[PDB]
Amino acid sequence: AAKDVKFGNDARVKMLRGVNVLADAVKVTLGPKGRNVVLDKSFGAPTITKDGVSVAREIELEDKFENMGAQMVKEVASKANDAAGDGTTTATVLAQAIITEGLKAVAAGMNPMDLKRGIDKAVTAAVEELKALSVPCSDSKAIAQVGTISANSDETVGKLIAEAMDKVGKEGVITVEDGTGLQDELDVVEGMQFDRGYLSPYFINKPETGAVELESPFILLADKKISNIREMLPVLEAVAKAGKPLLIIAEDVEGEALATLVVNTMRGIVKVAAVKAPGFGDRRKAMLQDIATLTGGTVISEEIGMELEKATLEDLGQAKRVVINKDTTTIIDGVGEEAAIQGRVAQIRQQREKLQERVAKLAGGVAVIKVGAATEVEMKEKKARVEDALHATRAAVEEGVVAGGGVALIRVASKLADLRGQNEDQNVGIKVALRAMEAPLRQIVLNCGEEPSVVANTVKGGDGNYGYNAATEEYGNMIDMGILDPTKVTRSALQYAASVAGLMITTECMVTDLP
Amino acid sequence: AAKDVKFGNDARVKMLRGVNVLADAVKVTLGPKGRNVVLDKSFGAPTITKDGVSVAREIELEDKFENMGAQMVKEVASKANDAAGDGTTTATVLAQAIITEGLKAVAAGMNPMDLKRGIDKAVTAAVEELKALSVPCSDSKAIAQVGTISANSDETVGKLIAEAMDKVGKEGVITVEDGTGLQDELDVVEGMQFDRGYLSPYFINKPETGAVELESPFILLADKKISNIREMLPVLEAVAKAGKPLLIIAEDVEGEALATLVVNTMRGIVKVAAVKAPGFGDRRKAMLQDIATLTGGTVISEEIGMELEKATLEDLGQAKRVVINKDTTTIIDGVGEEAAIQGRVAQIRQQREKLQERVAKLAGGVAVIKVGAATEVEMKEKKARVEDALHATRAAVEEGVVAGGGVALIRVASKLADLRGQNEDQNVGIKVALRAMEAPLRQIVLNCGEEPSVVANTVKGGDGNYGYNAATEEYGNMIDMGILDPTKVTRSALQYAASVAGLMITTECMVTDLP
């Protein structure tokens, strides 16, 4: 189609208007005196939601340029979510702030590509500074801490999470299943989790989680690449008449057999899914046997001659459940003998870090959680927030908590008061990020109907963990008042907003379709 | 789609206009000198109706923002209805009142989120105060009392209801069936009711009640979850050629067998429905056997080996009728032997509160009512109002009656004259609810063509149960004049209006589709 092209200031004013519409809709939900947004859906009833990414994903504008603005910032809130699990509003609010302040400088005659270098440097430093402040996140306290936070105040949540890790460890494998009743349930049962995602978004049966939940399925363990679909029918027809679903772990699954399986589930007979075997080369040889042992199945190897055509139900493994998402597969309760698994444990124990990881995965079991609730809505809803929190937590653990209320950010801004760049434009670029670092605190206060600059002035008069408690309307030590954000989320908010807004301010020309 | 977004006052003026259109259409029906509203329906002839929720559910506006207003208040009238069975107009009128007064304060510079806290506190207190005033609702008087009221003055109604409970008790199980002739009929026959709703709105054969009525059907009693549909065909084909419908009680029915059954009734051969078995864990084991005994059927247990494939008609139970709705299942006249049921009674009697509940349900029978009427219209129409009243009554019983004419509300408003909050905005928020509490009385009077403030002044000059009798145009003791509202309804009106309007006034921005 013929394109519309806009230059310089015009392009930019439009781009910003876009950002604002999205930013403004997301902002209203930030903080304890945050309000909700209603999101239409022809489909079913509207949705009420506080969740920043959820509002973001729905904004699309009519003016094609404004649209482009919104479609870009939408990525910060989106990315935050995939990494952290929370902070998507904060992320958005920082991004809008850097942009506003950025473009103001660009309009001053500053060189955008330098303003960007400044912003980026300011951020690399803020990230370092946050690692310092974080206390870390180790003890079950900090854990249920961050958890309950990312779970949105709900302490019961951060709780189970801490308990969980406190059971199978910080690296243990935790999962989530809908609760049968009103009570939450944490159980440890014979499992494993590895870093492999689905081979097609078309296997998703739970659109909500964006995941693949399968009920007591068989597991196929193939050593070769799967291109042709002919060697599938002997087994794929035996598990058709067994009523149950089927999981495929192989070197890969190529377009030919994949695309047939893809349309074979959605709209099709047997509902199945497939994922690449973990690791590569010599690891996946033994790493795949690990799964075989756990599930009580057989590995179809090429070096023994075994082919897929010469395989039965008996050769397959089994579990009571399994969940696959974008990049994670986790199996729960393997039918594998206690003798067989313990035998393979002693085998590796005998056999230093890479073998240690295989022991940890295997010996070890998988912890499960059943989100209890009164209503099926809340139920599955709560279940959601859980998986979220869990995320941040794992991340929080890997890299802790910091003072909430966005004080952490305000604190790093004064530490970097003396940061400079290679030239004056880079300097303004730093001051632009620092000034933005105040925005979460500033929005939190503004959503309470209170003077945001007056609160900020007095928090900035303080030190360490002194902050504003928006709930109770009085100042104090944020960690003592239990207002903690997880470090991974605060960091991640910052990195992502900076990344997008950094690029965004360097825009001199925009190219889109005609109205 | 591209969205329209409106801020602050503009958003709010539009939101209110919406509320008014709906409120105004509902208001005209409040009280004894209430008039009717005509509701178009391409479908059949138009509908004449006084029933507040019925008017509400039809309002949809063209201006997309105004629409949003109306679509939200529509929920108070809707919620009132699902809980109470009456008071939907009152509910609506209170909601419109809180909103009007609210937004006026918001426009004064008050902090909405505080006005909300005030309103809410004022309400929590009004609810307490109403519990005090209620006399309760216990004696068959108060019962037929509230009944006849919620039935819309019709004394004959409140009557049978009192009789009913007076038969199988307040907790007894009462049902309703269309009358064969012109006479009402109350009969007690060999039944049970438990807290479980249909597994899909697609089983509804009576669109009016929003329920599932089934004629002398067989009952299937399964101990396991029902996912696959293959174990269904041996029995589902034997009851296909028996001409009769079939009820399924199992641990659950999963999408796979559910979705097949769903399209198998509407547009399909055998008309069936399914509901989850009552309770959970060890209760539903024996609780399901209770039903088996009553219906003269067999429980298909897993721990005995019995599967659904190895089951006949003989294994199934039977009743003369059964009605399922949103969250209630009730079976009527079980074919179960008098010996078998009495034997199971003595079994539990031997076996303290949870077992007591199972005795009550079982021993005991189910009372039925046949709404008599001249015309089939009135007939089924009257039948409706009945089920309504019955509701409120059960509720009234659980938590009585209060002075009608909306005097109860006016009375609690003076009791709370001294209620205060945490700050001045919270105070205005209280005064806003109190002032609203006068509105039902004020509308009742306004629908009579009389001076509403002059009536209110003089009712507020009085005490206790002194009120205005709009029918006869003179003041007096409302309980003595027989003008009683059920407590549960007055309470419920208030709680729901407050809930919605409370949220509504905190609105600073609105996001909808383009015109």
Add this chain to the structure above:
Amino acid sequence: AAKDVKFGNDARVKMLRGVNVLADAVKVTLGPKGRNVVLDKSFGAPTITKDGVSVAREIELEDKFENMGAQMVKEVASKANDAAGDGTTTATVLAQAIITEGLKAVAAGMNPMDLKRGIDKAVTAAVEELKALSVPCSDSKAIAQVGTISANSDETVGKLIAEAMDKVGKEGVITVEDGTGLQDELDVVEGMQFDRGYLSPYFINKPETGAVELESPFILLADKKISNIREMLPVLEAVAKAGKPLLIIAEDVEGEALATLVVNTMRGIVKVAAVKAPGFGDRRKAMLQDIATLTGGTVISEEIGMELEKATLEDLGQAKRVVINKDTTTIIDGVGEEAAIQGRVAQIRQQREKLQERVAKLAGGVAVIKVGAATEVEMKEKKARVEDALHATRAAVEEGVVAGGGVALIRVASKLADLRGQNEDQNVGIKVALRAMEAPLRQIVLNCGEEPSVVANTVKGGDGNYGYNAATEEYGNMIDMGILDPTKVTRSALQYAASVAGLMITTECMVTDLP
């Protein structure tokens, strides 16, 4: 859809405009110097008609509010017709009059709901007063009297009607069939009529009468409810190959067998119809046997074991004709033996009021009428007017005649000159009905091109039955000049107009779809 809502005066001016358009189109046909209205019909040729209801049923307006006006008054003319058979124009003209005068008072500041109470009281009194004036309608004179009138002057009509009743009695059963030639024919033959209408408007084969005429059909007499259609095929296939139609009398016919039969006639093989058996309980047991005896059929009882599957043609009854309408079934010329019927007569004669009614129906036969005519048009047309008249007559008999020219009404208006209500608004409400009572006379005169108020003044100067003879243009005694209206029609006109217009004037708000 988005709705338009109008308030107060605006709503009302529009509502009235609607009424007028319909009223004005109907008015032009009132009285002996009434003119015709032409009614388009894409379908066939246009229709010329004097018949008030026929004009009414065609008015639909474009302005959605005006439409609502017309769609409401349309009900008076419609209701008149269903009860009386005549007077539909009068009804309409009164209704328009009450409305006009009403709304004028509402605009004076009067309280509508009181104006209504007045109107209603004035009417309850006018009805009483008319019962007084009626002379009654008993002798064959008054009968052919009212008949010939409601038949529109046609004396030949009122004639046969009187003859008829003079044959099988006032309660005898009279029917109508198209005439074979040009001569009218009255014949008495071996029949019965009971108060039961068709079980679906979809059995109608004569769209004109809105009835179900069936030619020498078989009669099925079932004791049970008919839900399933399987027990139908043994008999329904034997009467398929007998070429003739089939009538079903049973306890009921439920949706399942009904909906199959419904589409099985229109668009289908065997043309059949079904009606509920007369009475209830113990009556319908013997009351159904009565029909069996008359038709020479067998009753398929449950208490003998007989099922519908085990039934032949031989078991069924037969008649030469049968007509079913909205609420009446009447069978004509039963094949039942003279011995069998006389035997059942002696059986009941032996066996006090309820058994007396069964004797009357049975012993007794059914009188038939064949409307003779030159053209098939006139023929079937005349046939129509007949059935009409017959109606009013039966009614006239049950509750006589009064002075035509609308003098009766003018006479009751002076009798009620001293009627008062509970307050002044109720008083105006009475004067509003009284003043309206003059309108028929006033329109009759206006359609003659003469001064309506001058005629009215001089009729009101007179007494008793003195009136204006519009045909001959001179005053006199209306009963002596043969200008009589039947009481039932005059009463019914009044009651219905009052009913609708009473409601209509209480309208403060109107809600409809957007243009």
Add this chain to the structure above:
Amino acid sequence: AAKDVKFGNDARVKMLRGVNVLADAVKVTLGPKGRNVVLDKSFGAPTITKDGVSVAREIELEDKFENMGAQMVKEVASKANDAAGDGTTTATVLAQAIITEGLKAVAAGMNPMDLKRGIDKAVTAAVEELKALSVPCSDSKAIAQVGTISANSDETVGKLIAEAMDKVGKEGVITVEDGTGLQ
């Protein structure tokens, strides 16, 4: 001419919008980090000015009601000027503040004529209190100071006026005209 008449809240929202436009244009010049306003004049070249009354006298709005708002507050800045000679911006900024806060209370259900009595009483008291705080101002140093702040922080103008009053006396006149040179 036919008149437009507006009531209650509508009248008031419009009246306020008027006040704001004038207030906002005058406000930007208040204080040492005050900026200038440019005032068109078909007549000659435009005028640059910091002087609050000068901006005020030029505001006239198109919406006839908003106009009325502005035309009324314009009188505070105008009156200040005729009496004092300075403070016209301050005057304007106070006036806009009382109004904003006032109308907010009126919208709360307060009785306007009482809000007025309060305001007036508060002011009669503030005037008394200021008489107290004032230290008289009689020494050349103090005089030079008011002069300086008046002249947007220009020490020379202060000094120059202080010197002037010192020489002519109290019962003596000082005029100001265009000079030839730069100083």
